[PDB]
C-alpha cells in the first residue's frame, strides 16, 4: 500500500493540468499544499497578502496563456481576495483560487475560521465548488481548469476542507484526470464575415478598435495584417498597446477623441463598449455610428449601440477569414482620403502638444517630463505595469509599447492593489525578463510591503512611484490645515527608503537628470529596486 | 435650500452618533468623506480598504456604538469582505458604506459595475442598495438599527453613484430619529436560581469570562461575581482587563489544568468554539456540567449540553446572579483542595514562564522580548497583538488591567487587522497611547498603513518580531533553491520602512536596547516602530 | 456489528427532537427517509406538491408549538418550496425542510437533479447546511432544530447527499445528540416596563394592538388580563383573533379605521408596523402618535414610527411584569371616558352596517350572506383556514374566533397556495379536530388536487370555495369577449365535482338555505368534503 495525502493529490493534479506557478500566504490548513506544490514541480511564491497573490495568478494566466494559481488560508484568507477574484471576472481572465476551509468533522462546531466562503466568490466565479470526497480531487481540479479556460474565461474557486487536505489514501484508489485541453477556436459565420467586409467598403470615415481580446486570442499577426491591408486608422485599447507597435503609421491613439466622434463606422475587434469607450454613445460618439463587432461572447453584441454586423467566434480565426475576403477583392480604403489626412493632422498636432510638456524640465518633476524618461528607457521586451490615476492614465499616451502583451494596468475593473501582484506575477512567468512597475503613491500603498517578496526571490522588478500627495495632487499647504486632506497622503514620504529597509535598491530622483540615471542604474541591477519620484502636486495632467 | 446625497449620508450618520470614518476615497465616494468632515465626523484616510474596515470595528468595540468605513465601488467594497466577515465572526457592529454604479448606467458596463451586494450578504445583518435619494436617512437609521440590536454584526449600505451627487430640496428629505442604544433583557428568574443551585453542588467549578462580558459593559458585575463566589475564573484573550489579570482568583496560569479537571464550568459571554476546544475531551472532562450565559439563544447547548441556560444581557443577569447569592451568602470554600490545586499548578507554571523571561540572548527570544513590553506597557494603553506565537505568547506575558484594552485576531483568527485596530483605537481615544505588537508575517498584510499614523500623528508604537516569516525560519532555509513556503526576509528592517514613511525607527538586537527603545518611543508625540530581530528558534513553550 | 443507514439516523434524530409530523412528496433519494420516519414513530403525510407540504410543516409548528417537518426530492422538489419556505420567514415561523441532493461520489458529473439548492434557501433560512459526514447526522438535525426554534424563529433547510441517505454504518459510531430544549423566555428591562405603564397613564386616547406574537408566546391569559385590568380598547390582528374572544366588550375590531386614526398612544404587543398596520403612518394614523412596543426582536423597534418605550423579551413574561406594575397602583383607564364611548359608538354603528349586508338574501349569494352562515355554524373549537382576497378579507370581520390559535390566513407574506397545506397540517396536528378551509376560487387553484390527501388519510376537513369568477369578481359577460379576462376564471366551475371525483363529499350551495344545510351536513361527515358556493361576481365587498 503506497499512500498519498490530499495536498499531494491537489499539487500533482495541478501540475498535470499545466500549472507552473502558485501564489499566496500559507497557514492553516493550506501550508502542506504549498509544500507539496514545490515537490510536485510547481514554483511557489510566498506573498504577504492574498489580494496581490490572486492578481499574480491572473497575470500569469494572461501572459503565459494557460492558468495561474493562488493559495489562500481558510476564512479571512480566502475572503481577502474577493476583489482580485472579481477583477479576473471583469477582465474575462482565467485563474484558480485554492482555499482551505473548516474540516468536515468539525462542521457546525465553531471550527477555526469556519465560514460560508462559497457564496462570496460565486457571483463572479465560473466554478465555485467545495471538495466532498478525497479520491475525487483530480476531478475537481480538472473541472476547475475546464470552466476557467473554456467558454468565456473567468476565475475559478476550489474550496478544500481542512481534514481532506491532510487525509491519506491508497494511491491506486485516487481517480486521476487527464489534462484539460487548451481552448478551441471557432470560425465566425461566413455570412457575417462577408457582410462585415461589405459594410467596411461602404464606410466613409471608418475606424478599427483593437481590444485586449485580440491579445488573449494571440492574434497580433492577423490584426496587423488586417489594419495594414485595409489602410484604416486603428485605435488600440490600453492593454492592446503592443499587439501592433504603437509607432505604427495608422495609429490614431493621438487623435482618440477625434476618431471616436467623427467615425461613421467602427470595427470593434475584441473590445467592449463599456466605460472605457464611453459606451459608444454621444457626446463622445457620432449619434448614428455603425458598428461591426468581433467578440466571441454572444451576449456582448449590440450593447449600448446596435451592432450592424456581429461576428462571434475566435478573433484570430475570424481575422483570417476577413483577410481571405479582402484578398479575394484586393480592396483598400483610399490612402489619399481626407479621413486619413484629417486624422493624421489631428494626431500630429496633439502629439506636438504632448511634446511640449515632455520637454518641460521642472524640479519637482511633472507627469510628462518624468514619463518621458520612462518612455525613452523602457526596454521594448520588458513588461510595463502601471497603476494609479493620472500616473496610469498619462502613461497610456507617453509610454509606447512595441511587443504584444507587455503592458498591464487596472483593466476593465479599474482596480487598485494589483501593481505589485502583476509585477511579481510577471517576473515569475518570465524568469529573466525585466519588469517595470510604475505606480502612484496612492496605488503603491495598497500592497507596499510586497516589495520584500521581490527581494526574497530576487526578482528583476523596478518600481517607480510618483509621490504627488496621495489620491490626487495635494499641495503641502493642504496638510497644514486642521482637517487633513481626504485623499491626501504624506508628500514627503520616501518609498525608496521603504524599499531599502526591505532589502532592495533605493533611488530618490528629484529632477530629469536624476531620473535618467536612476532608471538605467536600476535596469543593470540583477534584482529589485524602487525609484522614488517626488512629483509636482500641481503637475498638468492634460496636454 | 438644496442638498445632495453625500451630505445627507454624512448628516444622517452624525445624527445616528457616528464619529469616525475610515476609507480610501475615489469615484464615486470622494464627496461623502468631504461631507463627513463638514458634518463633524473625523475621516481617517487609509491606504487599503481592509484595515479601514477593521478600524471601524475597533471604534465600535471600544466606543460602544458604531464605527464607519467608506469604500470605492467595485474593487473597493470587495477589498474588505474578510474584514466585514471578521466583524460578523466576533459579533461586532459596524457600517461599510460603499459606492456603486449609477442608476442611469445600469446594464451598460459602467465603471466598476458589479454585484457587490451579494458578496457581503452571507455575513451582513443588513445589506441594501439605496433606491430613493430622499430616503437616505431611513437607509442609514436602519443600517444602525440592524447592526447594534439583536446579535450585533456588520451592515453594508450600497449607494448608487448618481444618487451620491444628485441634489434635492432639503425640506423633501425624510430625516430619521436617532436609533436608540440596544435594550437589555432580564433572564428567567427560575433559570437564575438553578444556576446558583448548580454552582453550590460543584466540587471543582470554574468561571470562564468571554469577550461578551466586555461587549456587555459588565466588567463591574463579573468581578463582583468571581469574588462573591470564590471560584477561580479564566479570561479569554480579549476578556483580559475586565478583571485585572493580577487577580488572586485568576486561573490563567493553569488554563489547561482547569479546563481538563473542572466538573462544572460557568460560561459567561463565551462560546465553546475552537478557542475553548469545543468543551470536548481530551482538553475537557466528558462529564463536565455547563452553565451558560449568552444573549444569543441559538448558541446554547452548542457542542456540549448546557445544563442551566440563561439568555439575556450578561450585566443584568449577573445582577440577578448576585442578588440570589446575597441571600444565602454562599461562597466556595477558601481552603478547598480545588482552589489549592489550581494555585499549585498556577504558581508552578508561572515560574516556568518567569524562568524563560529571565533568559537574555542575542537575538532576543519570545519571553525576553515580551518581558520588556509588559514592564513598560502603561495600564491605560490599547494593546494590539497580531500574529501567531507573537500574539499567542503575549496572552501569557503581557498583562491587562483595564477593561477592553487588548485587541487581537479574535474569533476569526484574521490577519491584517493590526494596523487598522491601532489606527482605530488611536482615533477613538485621542489622548491615549497605543501599542501595536505584530509578527513580521502579520505586519506585511498592511505595513504601509504606518504612514496614516504619520500623516495624522497618532501615538501608535509598532513592535515587529522578525523571526523569518510565518513561523521561525533559520537563515539556512533561505539558501536552498526552493525558498521556504512560509519564510520572509530575516534581514528586513521594518523600522527603516517606518523611517521612510516619516516615523521614529528603532532596532532592538538585545534586551537593553529594547528597554531603551520602548521607553523612548513611549515619550514621542507621534508614531514609531521598534524592529526586534527575534531568534528563529526561540522558545514557544514555557 | 449492528448497522444502521442514513435515513434511519435522520428519522430517529427527528423523533428524539420532538418531531411528530412530516409532509412531502417521496422520490429519489428521500423515499427511504419517509419509510424510516414511519418506523421511527413520525407520522408521514404524502402530499401532491412540495409547496403545501412545506406550508403544512409551519402550520404544525405554529399550532403544535414545536417543529414541523417537510421532505422534498432533490433538485426541482426542494426548489418548489422556496415560496413556502420564505413564508415561514416572513411570519417568523419555525420549520425544517429536509431535501435530498446529488450523491457525493457524483458531484460535478451531471448527476440526476444535481443543482445548487443551498443558495436558493439561504436568503430566508435560519439554518441551511449540507450534511458532510454520515456519523454526524444528529448534529445537523439538532443544529437545525436549534436555529429554527431559538432566537427569532424561522425556517431551516437540511440538505442530504443521496449516497449518505442510503449509506450504512455501525450504530455505535453514530454521534447522537440530546433533545434541543424548548425556547426560553426573557423578562423585559424593568426600567422599560415601569416607563411603559407610566406612558399609558398619560395617554388620552390609548389603544392596545395584539399581534400573532402573543399567540406564539402562548400569552392569551396575560393579554386578556392586561386589556381587562387597563380598560383600554384593543385591536386584534387577523391571526390574533381568538386569543381574546372576538365578542369581548373592549374589542375595537369594528372601529379599526377609527381607533388607528385617533389614537394618541398605541401599545403594540407582539405585532409589527408593516403593511398590515399601514406602517403606523398617516393618513391612516395620527401624525404624532406615541408608540409603546413589545417585541422580542430588538431589530423591530422604532421601525417606520419611533418607539417611545420599547420592551424586548418574551411577551408572556413582560405582560406578567406589566400586570405587577398595574397591581401595585391599581390603575385603570376611565371607563366613562369619551374615548371608550366614541369607540363604542363607532363600533356599534359599523357593526350594524355589516348586519345589514349579512341579512341580505341573494341567489347567487354575496360575501356577507355566505360568510354569515359560516360564522353561525363554525365550531368555536375548530380551526378556520382562510385564503384569498376579499373572501379572506371580509371573513376577518364576519367570522369571529373565540379560542387562541384557531385562524390561519395568508399571514405577513400574503401568500397563496397555503390553504390546503394549512388545513391538512392542522388536521394532522390535531387528529380529531374539525378543520374549515374557506378559500376563493383563485386561491383554491394553487393546490386543488391536494384534497385527495384529505381523502387518502380521511381528514375531517370541510372546504368552502367562493366561485366569483377568479382573481376578483368577473361577470359572465367579460368571458364572452375575444381577450379572455386577465384575472378571470371559469364562473361555472364546479369544485365540488372536483372533490367528488377525488373521493370526497360534494355540495353546491346556491342560496342561503342550501349553504346552511351543506355546512351542517359536512360537519357530521367523518371525512373530507367541499361546499361549492357560486358567488355573485358583483358582490359588495364593503359594508
Ligand atoms: N480569443 C478570443 N477571441 C475572440 N474574442 C475574445 C477572445 N478573448 C476575449 N475576447 C473578447 O474580448 C472582450 C474583452 O473586451 P475588453 O477587455 O472589455 O476590451 P478592452 O480591451 O477595451 O478592455 C470580451 O468580451 C471577450 O468576449
Ligand atoms: N450583552 C451580552 N449578554 C450576554 N451575552 C453576550 C452579550 N454580548 C455578547 N454576548 C455573547 O458573547 C459571545 C461571544 O463569544 P466569543 O466572542 O466566542 O468569546 P471569546 O472570543 O471571548 O472566547 C457571543 O456568542 C454573544 O452571543
Ligand atoms: N414569544 C414571543 N415573545 C415576544 N414577542 C414575540 C414572540 N414571538 C414573536 N414575537 C414577535 O412578534 C412579531 C410578529 O409580528 P407580526 O406577525 O408581523 O404581527 P401580525 O400579528 O400583525 O402579523 C415578531 O416581530 C416577533 O419579534
Ligand atoms: C480597491 C480600490 N480602492 C480604491 C480605488 C479608487 N482609486 C482609483 S485610482 C486611486 C489612487 C490614485 O492615486 P495615485 O495612484 O497616487 O495617482 P495620481 O495622484 O498620481 O494620479 C484610487 C484610490 C480603486 N480603483 N480600487
Ligand atoms: C487573513 C489571514 N491570512 C492568513 C492567515 C494565516 N496566519 C495565521 S498566523 C499568520 C502569520 C504568522 O506569522 P507571524 O505574525 O510572524 O508570527 P510568528 O512568527 O511570531 O509565529 C498567518 C498568515 C490568517 N490567520 N488570516
Ligand atoms: C403565490 C401567490 N401568487 C399570487 C398571489 C396574488 N394573489 C393574492 S390573492 C389572489 C387570488 C384572489 O382570488 P380569490 O381567492 O378567488 O378571491 P376573491 O375573488 O373571492 O376575493 C392572488 C392571485 C399571491 N398572494 N401569492
Ligand atoms: Mg499620486
Ligand atoms: Mg514572525
Ligand atoms: Mg374569487
Residue numbers in the entry:
A (entry chain A), C (entry chain A): 8 to 550
B (entry chain B): 9 to 550
Task: Pull text from the paper.
One such enzyme is 2-hydroxyacyl-CoA lyase/synthase (HACL/S), which catalyzes the reversible cleavage of 2-hydroxyacyl-CoA (2hcCoA) into formyl-CoA (fCoA) and an aldehyde or ketone. Originally identified in the mammalian α-oxidation pathway of 3-methyl-branched fatty acids, HACL/S has demonstrated remarkable catalytic reversibility, as it is capable of condensing fCoA with various substrates covering a wide range of aldehydes and ketones with different carbon chain lengths. All the enzymes are tetramers, specifically dimers of dimers (α2), where α2 dimer represents a catalytical unit. The three domains have specific functions: the N-terminal domain binds the pyrimidine of ThDP (PYR), the middle domain has a regulatory function (R) and binds ADP, and the C-terminal domain binds the pyrophosphoryl group (PP) of ThDP.
We have determined ten high-resolution structures of enzymes from the HACL/S sub-family, including DhcHACL/S, CcHACL/S, TbHACL/S, CfhHACL/S, and ApbHACL/S and measure kinetic parameters for all purified enzymes. All structures contain well-defined bound ThDP and ADP. All our HACL/S structures contain bound ADP in the R domain, which assumes the Rossmann fold nucleotide binding unit.
